[PDB]
Amino acid sequence: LKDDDFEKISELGAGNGGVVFKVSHKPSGLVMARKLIHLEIKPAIRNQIIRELQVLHECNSPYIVGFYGAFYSDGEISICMEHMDGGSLDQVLKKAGRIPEQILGKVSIAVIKGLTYLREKHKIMHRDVKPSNILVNSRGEIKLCDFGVSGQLIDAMANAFVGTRSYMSPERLQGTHYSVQSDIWSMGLSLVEMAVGRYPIPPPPMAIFELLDYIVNEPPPKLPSGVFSLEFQDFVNKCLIKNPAERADLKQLMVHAFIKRSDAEEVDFAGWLCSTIG
């Protein structure tokens, strides 16, 4: 895949790392998302990142977004993924005041299945479990994107401008050993940010470092009781545990009653998504 064979149709969104454009593939005539991450790195690092991103070809699962290729055009690494009509879930928070609990359970099931597929088949941790990094489709599909396939890409990203928010587990910020439990902590934070209609680090603005200190040395946030089921509060509390050892691992999360019950429940997520985003 080359730069000259895409015609940018629209902008999907822009983040601190880069900007994603809804584009067309001239040779094949299909619409795909093209993520441009601007970074100034060595050509050897560019080739290393491209080869490491090639691995994304065999990452096939209903809970991870598609991948067609990646290449470096001019001062930017460009990754080509399959287009998700619903965009990301942060777009949904901008649409709806708060995500309902049943679809939130569906989201949780999708993300844990994606995480366990990634861990079991690729030995890869997401490290970026955010509302912006899980994507939704018109048919009801929920997939994971922007996970840590290329380590050198993460190292190049490390040199980044300051952010506004953070979804990091305290063990990563402290610098201690981190495992998938960091991803579970991040996804628990994401569940809190979806259930309530706000970014939940400063419980009901505050700068980035103050956010980070607060999530390092003070108790983790919790959902507002009385407007949510006890099961989903138990699920997020087990996800949002400061100690990685006490925090539940994936194997407990599959057999977590929240996940099993939400899988038993039949929720028409496609219709609700179409209603809330038009």
């Binding site: 601007h38 100034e40 790195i41 060595k42 001062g75 490290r127 380590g151 993460i154 190292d155 990203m157 490390a158 040199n159 980044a160 401008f161 300051v162 952010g163 953070s166 990091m168 990563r172 910020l173 402290q174 610098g175 603005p205 700068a207 980035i208 470092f209 103050e210 980070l212 200190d213 390092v216």
Partner: protein
């Protein structure tokens, strides 16, 4: 203000923390940075125009010229175009092999430029290796200085007063935001010390951290500092003392740029 009809926008170069760079041809080669601000409030725009004035007066061999602004092609600034690449590109992207005296000369020129900028009470925030360009080969040019009214977003008539820019060069005191006005001379001194570390190491600091968030937290809390064992063995010892001096956590203990300039003048 500069009338946009005379300026012509050539191929894009890139984007940054608060603007996007185009190549312009207004009375010669220039660089036009369209700002990310979509609806600049009149107060912000007026304070920015006062900046346009102050920065247009500034004239050093070591800082890029600041011609002016234009409100027609959205909100934009016209600055001197630098054919020479950025210092970040030479040190990391191109891995340019600089001799000892060349690195000392880059440090001296940067210190001189920041000294002049500080003498007119201009706090060159967003100070990093990206903003330094090696014109004609070795002459150091500081750009993207000042512009505090634009780099930061505005909550109407109130500036957001929150950090903005790359975190590897940011001061712990401006990372913490413990004060409404933490940008000062010493913050620029710390940022210059970080660029000094990059000059004396050839690598970005905190290479053992892969996530920027961990960097921010452990810098502001003091758990992480640029270790001085990465510096070159051929680096003079007083140069090492100078850089360790510039990167100290305590704001007030960091020296002011005349002292640093005296330090390199002793080194050379």
């Amino acid at each position: 203000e500069i009338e946009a009809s005379e300026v012509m926008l050539s191929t894009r170069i890139g984007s940054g923390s608060f603007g996007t760079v185009y190549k312009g041809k207004w009375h010669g080669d220039v660089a036009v940075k369209i700002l990310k601000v979509v609806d600049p409030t009149p107060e912000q725009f007026q304070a920015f125009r006062n900046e346009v004035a102050v920065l247009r007066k500034t004239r050093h061999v070591n800082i890029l010229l600041f011609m002016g602004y234009m409100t027609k092609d959205n909100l934009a600034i016209v600055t001197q175009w630098c054919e020479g690449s950025s210092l970040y590109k030479h040190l990391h992207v191109q891995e340019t092999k600089f001799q000892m005296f060349q690195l000392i000369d880059i440090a001296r020129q940067t210190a001189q430029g920041m000294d002049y900028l500080h003498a007119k009470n201009i706090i060159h925030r967003d100070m990093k290796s990206n903003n330094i360009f090696l014109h004609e080969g070795l002459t150091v040019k500081i750009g993207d200085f000042g512009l505090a009214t634009v780099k930061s977003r505005w909550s109407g008539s109130q500036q957001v007063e929150q950090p903005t820019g790359s975190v590897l060069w940011m001061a712990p005191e401006v990372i913490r935001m413990q004060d409404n006005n933490p940008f000062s001379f010493q913050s620029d001194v710390y940022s210059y010390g970080i660029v000094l570390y990059e000059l004396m190491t050839g690598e970005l600091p905190y290479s053992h951290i892969n996530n920027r968030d961990q960097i921010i937290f452990m810098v502001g809390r003091g758990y992480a500092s640029p270790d001085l064992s990465k510096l070159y063995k051929n680096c003079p010892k007083a140069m090492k003392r100078l850089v360790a001096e510039c990167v100290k956590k305590v704001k007030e203990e960091r020296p002011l740029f005349p002292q640093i300039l005296s330090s390199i003048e002793l080194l050379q």
